[PDB]
């Protein structure tokens, strides 16, 4: 399973939390929830 | 190239929108900007 997005810019407040925002959408076509790790891979 | 990140809960304006924010560390690693276009896969 994979997805592909758009990369948009950070939240302040969250540079530097190596962290992806990705809605349930998307996280619904990887079977993942808040709080899983993704690997990100250019198209 | 790749990167690892951390799934979080989209913005609530982003849903629907197909995007993943993701900060200018883990652009840096992929060698990607802010409107390309990545593949993500669970880890």
Same mark, same amino acid.
């Given at each position: 399973?994979?997805?592909?997005?758009?990369?948009?810019?950070?939240?302040?407040?969250?540079?530097?939390?190596?962290?992806?925002?990705?809605?349930?959408? /998307?996280?619904?076509?990887?079977?993942?929830?808040?709080?899983?790790?993704? /690997?990100?891979?250019?198209?």
């Amino acid at each position: 399973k994979s997805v592909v997005a758009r990369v948009a810019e950070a939240y302040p407040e969250d540079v530097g939390k190596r962290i992806v925002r990705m809605d349930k959408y /998307e996280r619904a076509k990887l079977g993942v929830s808040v709080g899983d790790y993704v /690997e990100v891979k250019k198209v």
